[PDB]
């Protein structure tokens, strides 16, 4: 358009470009639109493209001051949703110039800011986002990544083992350290603060960090293996968050943890840069993901949140446990684990991967499994996740009949037996019981652990 | 309740019973099957936690024969009978070790 | 190369990839090489590629710790210099 004509106009006239070929620099988004009957697909797609980028509900003269053809987001492909005729996939291209470089915040705000509120759609689901390599290079990414972390902690050949201290709340700092000490001395690589553990009247953070570090060092001396505890630095303000991170560095804590959604992307990105500058590993908890990621018709798929975390920065990311998930959602889970860890993920619709995602040199992130998992889950966990994973057994350790040290040893024996059997070429999931039963003959801890919880 | 007895450990597989020749052989074979280069490290027991153990000769880049690896382990053991001895497998694609485990515990 | 063999080796064997197609992420350099008579073009191009990136005058075992195929710079095209037969353009991808 070259002349200014005021009034309301249809989004399709400008934001639906079926013949557009996305550039390599473009950010691409796949939205699953469940529109209200009566609204046209192209118009729904164009409306999402316009409102997420440069469009307005009515024509504004200021558009003529700039070149909307260059800047505008454009819907370029419509596809059916397999097996769901109420919904369709809209593919929208966004010029890279629309986004602040190195800002997952800005890109996220633009894509999810207000399109989710449209009365035209019954539901809007952001399925996938193609971050071009040019954008990826502007982002800090994981402060260390899988390989650097293994070198720093001198851990090779197996998944790492972790435990969340339980109960989630209520323990004093000294008792918290006692629980940490017992878990670590028994064979866990890591222990962690619960996501809810920040600084509470029952346990102030500085007291917690001191006792935990004492526990970590004592266990490390007594086992001859490196140990860590993810100290939660999630805090009310950035100043408080950095203060806690600095104290962890000062006392020699190798790893800290943060809640990137609840704490927020701005805080997380700053923390990730701080972690890289100070050599501290960063474990990321995904609290609130289920609020946003569960509903298949409305929200954001976790795979998108996974990509944002890798760009924002974390050395570990909580990924849930595939054991609970059904086979339909298993392939999707394997999909985002590849996104978390691999360098190049090719497009694969069966796994929910709508775009080729190139990470280039950006390091991979440890996948973290947790939940109500215990020794019996070990074979399936080792199979699904592989070596570059952290398996966290909170209840499965502190709930052992003989205490944390025995529970840790039971999990450690189960893990090592599964790994040894895998390396020998056995099908660990098929032979899981036999493997665990054989290992239990040499470990009373594993034996009673297998009796405590059911297969 | 049984009391858990604290003792020093040696990382991967150290919580399992000590490996016979067959178990050790299977791990080396797996490493070669992955395309990893086996290597041997050794160190004085008190220095076990150092980042840099002594390297025995060079990593056996492209070694396909597990018997050669086992012979090297014996040769390292003979040269340094009090040292702990660790088998490693270099993964040049990840520039990390694919596996590492202590074959002899030292002293 | 998978095994370590010490000694001096020709740069061409590794750093001259006439069939390489540069990636979009690659940094490309065009050098006008005026070589001394007796030296081969490809070897001159490969030598520039090796020394500007990952190469060494002699074989080092540490190469085997990493993946030189991924990291190495590679000369991928040789062209004549129009009107100057003493010189040639070497195109190297990094």
């Amino acid at each position: 358009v070259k002349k200014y004509s005021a009034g309301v106009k249809e989004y399709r006239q400008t934001y639906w470009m079926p013949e557009y070929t996305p550039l390599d620099s473009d950010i691409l988004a796949c939205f699953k639109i469940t529109p209200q009957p009566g609204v046209d697909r192209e118009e729904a797609a164009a409306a999402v493209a316009a409102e997420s980028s440069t469009g307005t509900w009515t024509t504004v003269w200021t558009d003529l001051l700039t070149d909307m053809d260059y800047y505008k987001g454009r819907a370029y492909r419509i596809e059916d949703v397999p097996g769901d005729d109420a919904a369709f996939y809209a593919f929208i291209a966004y010029p890279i110039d629309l986004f602040e470089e190195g800002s997952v915040v800005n890109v996220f705000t633009s894509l999810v800011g207000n399109v989710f509120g449209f009365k035209a759609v019954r539901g809007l689901r952001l399925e996938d986002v193609r971050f071009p390599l040019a954008y990826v290079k502007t982002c800090g990414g994981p402060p260390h990544g899988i390989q650097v972390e293994r070198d720093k902690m001198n851990k090779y050949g197996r998944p790492l083992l972790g435990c969340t201290i339980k109960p989630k709340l209520g323990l004093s700092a000294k008792n918290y350290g006692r629980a940490v000490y017992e878990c670590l001395r028994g064979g866990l690589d890591f222990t962690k603060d619960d996501e809810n553990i920040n600084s509470q009247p029952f346990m102030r953070w500085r007291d917690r960090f001191l006792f935990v570090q004492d526990a970590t060092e004592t266990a490390e001396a007594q086992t001859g293996e490196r140990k860590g505890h993810y100290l939660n630095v999630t805090a009310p303000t950035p100043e408080e968050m950095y203060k806690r991170a600095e104290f962890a560095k000062e006392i020699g804590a190798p790893i800290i943890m943060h809640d990137y959604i609840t704490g927020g992307f701005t805080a997380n990105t700053g923390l990730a840069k701080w972690c890289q500058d100070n050599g501290v590993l960063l474990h990321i908890h995904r609290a609130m993901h289920a609020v946003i990621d569960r509903n298949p018709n409305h929200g954001i798929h976790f795979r998108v949140l996974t990509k944002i975390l890798r760009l924002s920065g974390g050395d570990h990311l909580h990924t849930g446990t595939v054991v609970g998930k059904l086979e339909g959602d298993r392939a999707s889970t394997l999909g985002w684990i590849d996104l978390l860890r691999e360098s190049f993920i090719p497009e694969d619709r069966s796994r929910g991967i709508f775009f080729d995602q190139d990470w280039g040199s950006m390091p991979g992130v440890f996948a973290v499994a947790s939940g109500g998992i215990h020794v019996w889950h070990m074979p399936a966990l080792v199979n699904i996740f592989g070596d570059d994973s952290v398996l966290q057994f909170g209840g499965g350790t502190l709930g052992h009949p003989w205490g944390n040290a025995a529970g840790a040893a039971a999990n450690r024996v189960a893990l090592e037996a599964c790994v040894e059997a895998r390396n020998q070429g056995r099908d660990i999931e098929k032979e899981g019981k036999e493997i665990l039963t054989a290992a239990a003959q040499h470990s009373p801890e594993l034996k009673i652990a297998m009796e405590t919880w059911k297969e | 309740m049984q009391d858990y007895k604290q003792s020093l450990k040696y990382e991967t597989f150290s919580y399992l019973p000590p490996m016979n020749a067959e178990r050790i052989r299977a791990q080396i074979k797996y490493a070669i099957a992955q395309g990893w280069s086996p290597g041997i490290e050794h160190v004085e027991v008190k220095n076990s936690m150092n980042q840099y153990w002594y390297m025995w000769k060079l990593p056996f880049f492209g070694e396909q024969n597990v018997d050669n690896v086992l012979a090297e382990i014996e040769a390292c053991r003979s040269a340094y009978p009090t040292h702990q001895v660790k088998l490693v497998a270099y993964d040049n694609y990840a520039q990390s070790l694919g596996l590492a485990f202590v074959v002899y515990r030292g002293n | 190369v998978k095994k370590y063999s010490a000694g001096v080796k020709e740069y061409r064997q590794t750093y001259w990839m006439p069939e390489y197609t540069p990636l979009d992420s690659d940094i490309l350099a065009c050098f006008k090489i005026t070589p001394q008579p007796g030296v081969d073009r490809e070897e001159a191009a490969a030598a520039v590629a090796a020394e500007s990136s990952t190469g060494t005058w002699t074989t080092v075992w540490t190469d085997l710790l990493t993946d030189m195929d991924y990291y190495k710079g590679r000369a991928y095209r040789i062209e004549d210099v129009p009107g100057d037969d003493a010189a040639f353009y070497a195109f190297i991808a990094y």
């Binding site: 860890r341 691999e342 190049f344 390091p363 991979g364 | 694609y93 990840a94 | 991924y70």
Partner: peptide
Amino acid sequence: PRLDLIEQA
């Protein structure tokens, strides 16, 4: 891992 399955490969 890492470099084994790059886009170039």
